[model samples]
Target: KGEELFTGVVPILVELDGDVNGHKFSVRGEGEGDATNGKLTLKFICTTGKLPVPWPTLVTTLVLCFARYPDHMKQHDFFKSAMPEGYVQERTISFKDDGYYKTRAEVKFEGDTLVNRIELKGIDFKEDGNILGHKLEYNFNSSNAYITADKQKNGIKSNFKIRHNVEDGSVQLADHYQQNTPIGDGPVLLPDNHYLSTQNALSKDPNEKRDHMVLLEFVTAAGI
Candidate 1:
């Protein structure tokens, strides 16, 4: 049998349920019910806890913290105000190869916010094996069991946002710091897609250099 577990893992799925506005995501363990006496708790997992660098929102940490991304982005910087505190996207849920492209994140939060723990490096990006000079690929699957109702009469829409602490900014394979040193930055900041605003300072902090950790809390928050 070939099976193992990695430390860094994030929840790509964002589930929602409940009346419009009152709608919220059942995060942490699980949640259920309507607005009256119901509460949607936000929960998510991460592949890595931190990456150790300043990162962007939509692209990988590398592009956000310090790399010049080449594309047209809706948000130049997704981290500035990227927390799903008060928002909602009412849509059916399913999974598939093209799911990532079709899945839309509708931010819906009443007054509180949900926390999203996501992995910086998507499993879909790399090919574990290859043959005949052809590159093999893997798909990252994120599912939204359900999304809360949208714009209901008694529905509430408090606030929502995407939050994360990008800390990595180095430009080398693996970390190279003194032993017994704690990394000051967070997460692995590598170039990929349009995750972040990567276009500057991809070096370690001369004064304080430590071992880097996985980037956690990249997109967190649940509001309504």
Candidate 2:
């Protein structure tokens, strides 16, 4: 037997000169699932637009939303039964200004690991009609989150952590950001328990700002 993941319509709007116009764009996504396979279909259409907007810009945003929509759906109780234990979804799009956008989402329900990443690099033509060096990225796992915002003339690195303390029944949050430098060591840890040892090791960094970054690790309790 097959199951349905999502079936709905989402409105797509474009704003120009302080006026919002939606007559041209629309999106519809359909999903069907079986024990061995899952299928998702996205239909995007733009009949017309009062103000001219680049097609690449419109598509890049839509596809990015499409890549992230599944993760949003996974959080709802109704879709839990239909989602498989393991799956990876990836999408990439290039803009007219020579910028590239990539998205990858993975769900490992059995291991309690979920990852969503969006990266944009290269040059982009801004609204002020200037081409600038742009590199933006967002990476997230079950326990950690990271972001890099480098646009126009400045670069920034940011990290965030959200932990749910089952014993205390409270939520804990930690975040750090720096300018013109890389924060943290490397990629976020997987479901493995080795993070406890690696995170405990103390090391010195040449830059004082890097040395002051905060690191937090959340433990996974028994029973999946």
Candidate 3:
């Protein structure tokens, strides 16, 4: 049960030979060159999407966003560009030990740029769990990335709306003033890596935060 399932993106062709589920027809990938005039071929590009907050990519995002490397580069950021679109790759950081040294995230994707959903948090930052935990939903081309979470440190909940933009090189993050309340709807000036930057701000020191090298090696097979 510990095994990771469909953990990354997978691209393939699914040819429906017939109605296999309802009427009791069965088929496999066979004689499949391509779809003919009367035939149909389903092309799928599935992904287990990762957030922009993991490791080496994290460092990259920080350097880009702040224009100066923060003291806590190693703890709190990752890059979305690290994993290319339309392919499978390890999406986030996770651990198996049930210890505090590692963090974890589970991701799923529906289409090329659409993230189905994600839950990311440390294994155990405290007895009450993570101070930086987040449950997020994004990529409906809805032009907004939505997020909700509880910040244990401040003992208050966090909600955010991030506008999606590709050419601008930064997305906009606007935290709701009240719980589910509509405020001014203005964005933070920095405009990207909302979760990463916010946590980095809260956690100012590299010494107390996590060093992701060991964890990443475990997940990305770093040496191999």
Candidate 4:
């Protein structure tokens, strides 16, 4: 009925299995944890479908229309040359966390690897002038990485913003324009409140065949 707390070192493990755009994936890992400090490491492997055209070409083709620029053509040529056209056998991802606000991860596909450092913020509830009600802002920022798989190297920077209602814990994807639209009716929170499951589609249009689908689950375990 009351809170349960533990002391001393404990072991932590989590298993996440899901699919992305019909490609299946599973992750399993174990680590050591304590009341104050700990580390968790995981490896993710997935069967990946054909890689899509890079975002720049799609954006330019839609917005810029007829006239094509040198930079756009360069990106088009690079993707056609560097990334494989057919389905990749598998992709491997590895990451480590220390219960900190930031972590580093690596992705390996084909013969190339990419490394990125992610910074997280505000999993806790807060209320502010911009927020009418209590909300939890779960945001992520990733550093750029080149083919050699080094964050200090060069590539692209990506940012993801998400929000959750403090009361019901419903989730929403956020952008500069809108914030109220829900993401897959929010995640299913387990009875213990330490586990969650959700799904999301990369595109809103149902006719977009290339739109990727993603399913995810999160778990938190504590021990003594």
Candidate 5:
């Protein structure tokens, strides 16, 4: 539901931490080439209890996932520079700190562009020091691949990756990795066109038993 989509570039740097400047995202829910400004609008309807979490945790999790992401040259502070000025006053709004609820967003273009990239910036979770993006699924007129269900076969949870291309992008080596992730642990890094390892642990105590994790990795050019 709140998954970030990369439309303009596949090797996106969604700078979320205190330094992320020019985070790239896609205009989700739009057809290829037919995508226009604000065409990337998606909604997430949480069918469970109130969204469980606080602001700080949600913010920190996003930051940690994109920890090493370098900020934009200008590095405009969204909270201080862009947001506090009453940015959320309009556009899509999120108040997860209140409770789990529905959220709407429309990725708009700058001046005049055929396709615009956009994403639903998730809220911070204070309890676990992590960010949880929106999760949603429904049947309209899309592809059958969109249909999904949990192991219990109770409900469906979305599982998909965003795709996009960069403008005159560059090439670089990557050090990306794939491993079982756990809260409090940092993100993994691997090289381009490569794969890494996952983490595993088995604790005697049910609580302590080491669980598993799934995280994404990406590397981008120098300028962007």
Candidate 6:
């Protein structure tokens, strides 16, 4: 009964305090629905930045994990599941803060794509510390080991794509397109790739990251 399945790339909590782009951040989830349908409230806060300043060169990727088979799970399990045949469900939540950007994301497993329809709202500021005012929306789709985002701001919309090879700290901007590419690719000596390499190393073995949700179910599991 300890068997598990390698579902797909789904959100996972590395720690309550997680690092994204060298900045300290925390993630928490509140689930309020059933297996086939539900609302997941996710909160992400930055521990390393001040009021109203825009995060230049944002790396818009959430840490994802593979779901285990026959395992009872958490909010993240709503994004991907051991039973690919399960009926789909969606979660809803809204967040707000002064300098913090809160997200209202509807996450679901949509036919091989782990899709997140996200709305970002907060007071965005100029580097000089003037409020630019911010209201943003996007749809992020992860599948086939790639991440793509369709973003909208000020009623103007655009699309961008990137795939990170965390193992070596390299991110690919697959194609050049559309307006407001928030995460520019130039000079931001990004954080170390230790997480990527270590995470990669863990997956080399099938069961490396699996954890027991209970005596009868596993949270993160993989197949041989």
Candidate 4 lDDT by residue in tens digits, 7-113: 24333332333332233333333333232222222222122433221111111001000111133222221111212111111122211111111122221122221
lDDT of each: 0.20, 0.24, 0.20, 0.21, 0.20, 0.25
Number of the top-ranking candidate, with TM-score as the measure: 6
Q: Where does candidate 2 stray beyond 4 Å?
A: 1-84, 116-132, 135-224
Residue 211, model 6: lDDT of: 20
User: Root-mean-square deviation of each candidate, in angstroms?
Assistant: 20.0, 20.4, 22.4, 23.1, 21.3, 19.1
Give lDDT for model 6: 0.25
Q: For candidate 5, write residues 48-167 as lDDT tens digits.
A: 223332222221122111112223311211111211111111112233332221222122222322222223343332332222332211111111112122224221222222111112
- Score residue 120 of candidate 1 by CA lDDT: 19
* Deviation in Å, model 4, residue 120 alpha carbon: 20
Q: What ranges in model 1 sit over 4 Å off?
A: 1-101, 114-215, 218-224
* Model 5 regions more than 4 Å off: 1-92, 96-113, 119-123, 126-224
> Where is model 4 poorest over a 10-residue stretch in terms of lDDT?
58-67
Candidate 2, position 172, lDDT = 22
The true-versus-predicted C-alpha distance at residue 181 of model 4, in Å, is 21
Worst 10 residues of 1 by lDDT: 173-182
TM-scores of all models?
0.19, 0.21, 0.16, 0.22, 0.17, 0.25
> What tens digits encode model 6's per-residue C-alpha lDDT throughout 1-224?
00122322233221133332233334332112112211122232333333122221122322122322122323223223223322211111111221333333333344543343343443332322212232221111231221222223211122334332222343323221222121222221111111101111111124523221110111232221
Error of 4 at 201 (Å): 28
Per-structure clash totals for the candidates: 89, 0, 3, 0, 25, 3
Residue-level error in angstroms, candidate 5, position 223:
47
